């Protein structure tokens, strides 16, 4: 695709989030950079309104899948980069088991050299003493598979996955994710065969930062489709 050329080097990132969870309103701003050659993200996020009223880990998926590393043999399945620079809309429903839901709508696009993710988030039906409003989730993050399928009727994609949030008592709070992405522009985009994104993330703090904040390092690689050279490597083994 033409948009894949925008991601051959290091790209600055800006993230803006406005949220309302059970009437608790807040804003988050994030800055950093992405290197799609290695599927690598480094970012720091700030709650600009004061204290964040939900645990930071619950916002990780909402806070740029165009930075995933697609292997060469899978380039024809990379919807996210193909929509650039005009961008795409990303929508999700996130259902916290035995608790409330987040509904999110974002636009991801280039503003000059900067890749921008602008989000609105609405949360309803949360329990006052639950794991979310009660701040019972540990400050860490697990590794996941994000399953992608084409959505031909909308010229876009769908994703389904389950995020596992560790609870301080040793249990798990499941967050079911249903996702839909559609292009903003009118140019051609790539509709993929079924595959997944393999993720890993580490959360930390900046010892010099007095605002409520989150430091993030993340690596994402596309997988689930073979290179088709299996029979060839069998022939090389015979020629050894």
What would you measure as the largest C-alpha separation in the chain, in angstroms?
Answer: 69
Domain range 2-239, CATH architecture: Beta Barrel (2.40)
Which tokens in the block code for residue 43? Answer: 């970012």
Backbone angles phi, psi at 65, to 5 degrees: -70, -10
Q: Cβ(120)–Cβ(202) under 8 Å?
A: no
- Run of H or E including 238: helix 230-239
Residue written as tokens 């409003």? 133
In angstroms, what is the resolution? Answer: 1.3
CA geometry: angle 31, 37, 40, nearest 5 deg = 40
Neighbours of 153 (CB within 10 A): 6
Q: Report how far residue 78's alpha carbon sits from residue 113's, in angstroms, rounded to the nearest whole number.
A: 21
DSSP for residue 191: P
39: left (phi over 0), alpha (psi -120 to 50) or beta: left
What residues does each domain of the chain span?
2-239
Q: Write the secondary structure of 100-145 as one string of H (helix), E (strand) and C (coil).
A: CEEEEEEEEEEECCEEEEEEEEEEECCCCCCCCCCCCECCCCCCCE
200 bridge partner residues? 219
């Amino acid at each position: 695709s033409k948009g894949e050329e925008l991601f051959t080097g290091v790209v600055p990132i800006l993230v803006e989030l406005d949220g309302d969870v059970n009437g608790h309103k807040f804003s988050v701003r994030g800055e950093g950079e992405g290197d799609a050659t290695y599927g690598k993200l480094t970012l720091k996020f700030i709650c600009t309104t004061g204290k964040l009223p939900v645990p930071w880990p619950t916002l990780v998926t909402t806070l740029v899948q165009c930075f995933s590393r697609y292997p060469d043999h899978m380039k024809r399945h990379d919807f996210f980069k193909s929509a650039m620079p005009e961008g795409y809309v990303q929508e999700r429903t996130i259902s916290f088991k035995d608790d409330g839901t987040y509904k999110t709508r974002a636009e991801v696009k280039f503003e000059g050299d900067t890749l921008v993710n602008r989000i609105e988030l609405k949360g309803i039906d949360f329990k006052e003493d639950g794991n979310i409003l009660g701040h019972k989730l540990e400050y860490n993050y697990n590794s996941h598979n994000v399953y992608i399928t084409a959505d031909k009727q909308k010229n876009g994609i769908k994703a389904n996955f389950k995020i596992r949030h560790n609870i301080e008592d040793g249990s798990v709070q499941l967050a079911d994710h249903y996702q839909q992405n559609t292009p903003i522009g009118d140019g051609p985009v790539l509709l993929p065969d079924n595959h997944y994104l393999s993720t890993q993330s580490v959360l930390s703090k900046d010892p010099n930062e007095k605002r409520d904040h989150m430091v993030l390092l993340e690596f994402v690689t596309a997988a689930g489709i073979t290179h088709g050279m299996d029979e060839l490597y069998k022939k090389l083994a015979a020629a050894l």
